[PDB]
Structure formats: structure tokens, C-alpha cells
Amino acid sequence: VFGNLHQLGGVPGTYQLVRSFLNIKLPAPLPGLQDGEVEGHPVWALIYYCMRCGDLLAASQVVNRAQHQLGEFKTWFQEYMNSKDRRLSPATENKLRLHYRRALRNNTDPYKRAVYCIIGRCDVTDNQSEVADKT
């Protein structure tokens, strides 16, 4: 971000810096393919990267604003965040896991899967298909 552009149009907030990474950096040669995008922005990729950065809170906020419909997950994100990040509810974690296996596991947008898998610790057999790009 600290190098030309726009200089990004908006304020230097962390969120925008990541939007820049996702948009300017190599998610697009000349933009496209299989993300879920609203208003020109891959939300799931954003949440994933923000999470990658360590900005969990911001990632949570993005989800809140998201316009999505897996919303139960939204709940499970927030408490994961609230606690020590080992979100352990004696309650639902089990429920989240079932949904992952049935709905999410066989399908979806790579980043969405990443967020579910990583936050949830959903499927211990380990590896994320499309978006592991670095060692």
C-alpha cells in the first residue's frame, strides 16, 4: 500500500489496506473467477486475509456487514473472537461442524471454506485447497 496508486483513494485503515492487497495484488491479472463478490469485493477473501494479518476483530466486523446467509456461522465467529480465540462453547461447535461437513465441505468458495475450517477446526485432516499460496 505504501507505494503509489489511488495513495489509495481512501483512508489508510487496515481494512482498506487489505482490500488493496486483494484487489491490486494478484487476485486479478485483470479481474475474475469463483469468488463471492458484492460491490466489487470478495468478502470471504477479505475476512480470510484480515484473519491472516491477525486483524480478527476487523474480520468479524466485515462478516457482520456481510450480506450473507450462512449467518449461524456469523454467531460462531463472534465468541471465537470474544474469548482467548479458543472459542470453546460447551454448546454449539458440534452444530457448526455438522453443517460444515454436509453443506460447506463438498462445494464452495475456497476462502469461505478456509474461514470455516480454520475458525472451526472443522476437519482435522488438513489442507486448504485453493488458497494456500505460501509456505
Partner: protein, 421 residues
Amino acid sequence: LYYAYFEMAPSDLLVLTKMFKEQGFGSRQTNRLVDETMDPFVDRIGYFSALILVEGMDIESLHKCALDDRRELHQFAQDGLICQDMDCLMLTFGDIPHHAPVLLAWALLRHTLNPEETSSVVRKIGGTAIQLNVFQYLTRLLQSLASGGNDCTTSTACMCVYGLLSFVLTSLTLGNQQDIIDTACEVLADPSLPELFWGTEPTSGLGIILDSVCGMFPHLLSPLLQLLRALVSGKSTAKKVYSFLDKMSFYNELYKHKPHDVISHEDGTLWRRQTPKLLYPLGGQTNLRIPQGTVGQVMLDDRAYLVRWEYSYSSWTLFTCEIEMLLHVVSTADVIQHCQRVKPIIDLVHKVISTDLSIADCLLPITSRIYMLLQRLTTVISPPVDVIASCVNCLTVLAARNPAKVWTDLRHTGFLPFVAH
């Protein structure tokens, strides 16, 4: 007949399994292995064996008990020892077909135990049973019991099969599928001619299957219509079923495309609101229009824009609009056309009118159209040939209410008139 009186006592139940163990469930025998006369005996004998064992297991009561049910009775479940004996015999049965229904039922029982314990094996037994074609087997057993083997013995007996299906629905132990529904419908069908005595069980089936079927209809035409048809004849509770047809809270169909409003909660593909829409576009004033403000839901989200409509309507009046459109093609229909639906639709009309016969007069939305369908329908084909039968049936039921008309119709009914020379 005796088991029907009370739940089985544990001693009785254990003895039951003991004999089945020694007998081998009476599986092997000589059927036409030898003479033909003996052959007709086999299915019926097997059915009794399956019915009785399932009756003894009393899967429905047992599962409830496991969850926790108040008691009166003593149950076999209480003694671990009895369970051990029963387990061995049934497990061995797993490698044989007749006691497939027992295998399925017990797998559920073991599985209810599963949360308490573990159940590696039961999963396999359930799988084997389904693969076993227990569903198909049940249908045949059901036919045997169906008005033939014995009126009184059978429907009390069929009830046993029904209980198994009730529990089986929960998981995916077995989701709402074609096989389960089909088998259930057949057990209910228990191919018979109208005559009332006993009925069947209630609500758990109701929400899971009967109501579920309604939700899909008319999108899924066959199940809802078939179930309605079977029940109406058999049950004296004509009013509830009939009232349902006259007053139908829900309508399920394919979705015409695009602008209608949506209301939000969750990411909601599901909820939306409507403005006015006409099921039938221009082709006669008579049209089905659904006022705006009606709520709708998008069920599948898969391959299609399938929406549920809260719109309450009369099933009979609706069907008696849909078929007519088929003739002209002048009108256009949101619903969608097909011959197969034709066979059950007319039959339901037929059955409803016949059953209601007395309060026949109110019942007919389809007097003239059906005859027109019949003349045009005349084909040299099996699917329509089946439909032709339905038309005839409707005519027969119609005859009591309006006799003159049927006869006037027959004067120029295409099938019969030899007279022309």
C-alpha cells in the same frame, strides 16, 4: 392378534427371539424347495414373522422409552441379558433377507443406544437392510396383507410396518426419500377397495411425511395426491382430508421469473413477498391470481427457482382449472403439464367424489372437462391408457349424482358407439 392387546412381556419377547433363532426365522423351506402349492404360503408366512417380531420390538415405544417414557409395562430393554440373546439372533439374521425389516428396526434401537454407547455394527445392519430392499419387501408384504390375506389381520398388522417408517425418517434413520415415501404410501395403500374399520397412526408421520408431501405439491404431484386419495377412501375422517383439499394453505410450484419483492432476515433466498401474479395468463377471465402481500419461500436453491407460496387455495378448483388448460393450450400455465400427473389427479377426483357420494353435489369442479379429456385423450398408449381408466372412474362415481348426464355423454362417447354402422 394377541400381541395387539398389550405390549409384549419380556419373557414373551425373549421366547419369541429364541424360537426365531432355532427356526432360523422359518426362512428355509421347500417352495416352488419343491411344490407350487406351498409357494403361495411363503410371503404370508414371512409377513407374519416380520410383523410379529417388529411388534415385539415395538420400536416406537422402545425408542421413546430410551429417551424416557413413563411406564406401566415391563420392557425387555430393562434386562441386558435379554438384549444379548436378541442381538445374536438378529445379527445372524443380517445375512438373510426376510427379517430385513427386523434388521432395520433393531438397527435403530441399537443406534438409540448409540449415543449412550457406540455402534459400529448397527450402521452396517441399517445399510444392509436398505440395500436389502427392505422398502420393496415391505411393499410386497403390505400387498399380501392388503385386502386379500385377511381384512382384520392385515391393517392391524400393517400398523407395525408403519411404525418402522415413522422412526426411519429422522436421519439421512433415513431421510425423506423416494423409497421411504413410496413404501409408506404402499403400506397405506395396502391395495384395497373402499371399506372402513380401523385407521392408522398419527402426527409423527403427519409432520414428517404427510405434511412434507403437501409442502412440495403441486411441484411434486404424485405423493401428495396419492396419499390423499388413499386416506380419503379408508378414513371416515373425510372432513379433515376433504377440508384440506377445499382449503389448502400452501401452494408449491416452479417460479416464474424475477421482479417480486423480498423481505429479509438471514441471507434470505428463502423469504420474499409478492405483488400480484396470475398463475394463468390470458386465456379466459377465470384465472388464479394471488394477491400481493403473500409470502413465499425459495426452497431448492438448486437448479431451479422453486418457490413455496403461502397462498391458500382450493385444490379441487385449482386442478379443475389446470387440466382444462391442457386441452386448449390457449391459456398459459405457470404450473406445467404432464400425463402422469393426469392419472393420479383424475383418480383423486374420482375417489373423492365417490367417497363423498351423498354430499356429491358440492364436490364436482370437473363435470364437462373430464369428458372432453376422455374423447381427446383416446390413445394407443400405456400412460394415457391408464389415464383413460381414471376418466371412466370419474364417470362412474359421477353417475350417482348426475345420472342423466353420464348417459347423455355415453350416447356420443367414442369408445362404445357401434350403432352408427
